[PDB]
Structure 1
Amino acid sequence: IVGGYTCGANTVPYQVSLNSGYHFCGGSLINSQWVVSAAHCYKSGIQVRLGEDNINVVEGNEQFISASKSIVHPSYNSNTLNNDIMLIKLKSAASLNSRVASISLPTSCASAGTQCLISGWGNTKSSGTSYPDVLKCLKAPILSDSSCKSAYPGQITSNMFCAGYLEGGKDSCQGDSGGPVVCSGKLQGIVSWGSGCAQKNKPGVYTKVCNYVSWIKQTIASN
């Protein structure tokens, strides 16, 4: 996260870290046994880390649970990142508490101008490289589809939206991929891609979760 702020420990209780020996992506807990992340975060051997603030220190509220299965969206296209969404089932159910809590799925898509909370452990610099240890947060509005497609001509599908600031300075960044965009208490986005980080006229691009609620609910119910 570039240009954001320290969330505060466990203030985003649905935020997970995906670990394969190191943090490599975020995700969002949607029930006791399921996480949603980005398809471009797929790999084998994922451990889901819940209750994290400092990802380099055991602080006493963590749950570490291996994934038992991953399901990449049937139409995921890695060349274009269309349908950049993946479900991860936990080998055992997470213990839900104050600091480990699920986030509701949308019943409706969100409108442009809606303010959302974006979070992650990704790079905090827009030209250099510095990775935080504690979770960072950013408040950012959903941008008009029209400004999104103008920023990225020919690359925005109906399954993507842009959020952030056209002037730059505040954005998601590498290491944030797969993590949440929450608006009005609903998981509306997944950190997907962008051109650099926090650059002018290059806002972050996010998977449009509201298009996938039927697929999410059906897949979970059958697995």
Structure 2
Amino acid sequence: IVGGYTCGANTVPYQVSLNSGYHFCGGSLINSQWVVSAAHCYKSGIQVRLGEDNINVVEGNEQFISASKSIVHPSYNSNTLNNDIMLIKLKSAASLNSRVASISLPTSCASAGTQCLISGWGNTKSSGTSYPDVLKCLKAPILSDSSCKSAYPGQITSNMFCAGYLEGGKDSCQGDSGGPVVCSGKLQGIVSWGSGCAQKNKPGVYTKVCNYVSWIKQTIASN
């Protein structure tokens, strides 16, 4: 997260870190046994880390649970990033409490103008690299489809939305992928892609979660 702020320990209780020996992506806990992330975060041997603030220090509220299965969206295209969504099932149910909590799926798609909270442990620099150890946060509005498409000609599908600031300086970034965009207490987006990070006229592009609620529910019901 570039140009954000320190969230505060366990203030984003649905935020998970995906770990394969090291943090590599974010995710969102949507019930005691399932995490939503980005398909481009797929790999084998994932350990889900809940209750995390400093990802390099055991602070006392962590739950580390290996994934039993991952399900990449059936129509995920890695070239265009269309349908950049996957589900990860935990081998055991997490223990839910105030610091480790699921986030609700949307009942309705969020509109341009709605303020959301974006969070992650990704790069905090637009130029060069610095990874924070604690969770970073950014409040950002959903942008209009027209401004999104104008910013990225020929690249924005009906399964994507832009959020952030056209002026630049405030954005998600590498390492934030798969993490949440939460608006009015609902998971509306997944950190997906963008040109660099926090660049002028290159806002963040996010998977449009509301399009996937049926697939998510049906997938969970049978797996």
**TM-score normalised to structure 2 length:** 1.00
- Structure 2 stretches of 5 or more lacking a match? none
Deviation (angstroms), 1:2: 0.1
Deviation (angstroms), 1:139: 0.0
Once residues 149 and 79 of structure 2 are traced to their aligned partners in structure 1, the CA distance between those partners, rounded to angstroms, is: 18
1:161 equivalent in structure 2: 161
SS of equivalent residue, structure 1 residue 104: coil
Once residues 205 and 111 of structure 2 are traced to their aligned partners in structure 1, the CA distance between those partners, rounded to angstroms, is: 15
Deviation (angstroms), 1:37: 0.1
Once residues 202 and 79 of structure 1 are traced to their aligned partners in structure 2, the CA distance between those partners, rounded to angstroms, is: 19
Once residues 191 and 217 of structure 1 are traced to their aligned partners in structure 2, the CA distance between those partners, rounded to angstroms, is: 20
Once residues 172 and 33 of structure 1 are traced to their aligned partners in structure 2, the CA distance between those partners, rounded to angstroms, is: 26
Once residues 199 and 74 of structure 2 are traced to their aligned partners in structure 1, the CA distance between those partners, rounded to angstroms, is: 32
TM-superposition CA deviations, 1:32-72 (whole Å, max 9, x none): 00000000000000000000000000000000000000000
Once residues 80 and 21 of structure 1 are traced to their aligned partners in structure 2, the CA distance between those partners, rounded to angstroms, is: 28
Once residues 164 and 181 of structure 1 are traced to their aligned partners in structure 2, the CA distance between those partners, rounded to angstroms, is: 11
- Structure 1 stretches of 5 or more lacking a match? none
Aligned residues: 223
Once residues 26 and 189 of structure 1 are traced to their aligned partners in structure 2, the CA distance between those partners, rounded to angstroms, is: 12
Percent identical among aligned pairs is 100
Once residues 52 and 184 of structure 1 are traced to their aligned partners in structure 2, the CA distance between those partners, rounded to angstroms, is: 22
Q: CA RMSD in A?
A: 0.2
2:136 equivalent in structure 1: 136
2:106 equivalent in structure 1: 106
Deviation (angstroms), 1:19: 0.1
- TM superposition outliers: structure 1 runs of 4+ over 6 Å: none
**TM-score normalised to structure 1 length:** 1.00
Once residues 132 and 164 of structure 1 are traced to their aligned partners in structure 2, the CA distance between those partners, rounded to angstroms, is: 20
Deviation (angstroms), 1:150: 0.3
SS of equivalent residue, structure 1 residue 69: strand
Once residues 35 and 199 of structure 1 are traced to their aligned partners in structure 2, the CA distance between those partners, rounded to angstroms, is: 30
Deviation (angstroms), 1:128: 1.1
Deviation (angstroms), 1:3: 0.1
Deviation (angstroms), 1:81: 0.3
Once residues 213 and 107 of structure 1 are traced to their aligned partners in structure 2, the CA distance between those partners, rounded to angstroms, is: 8
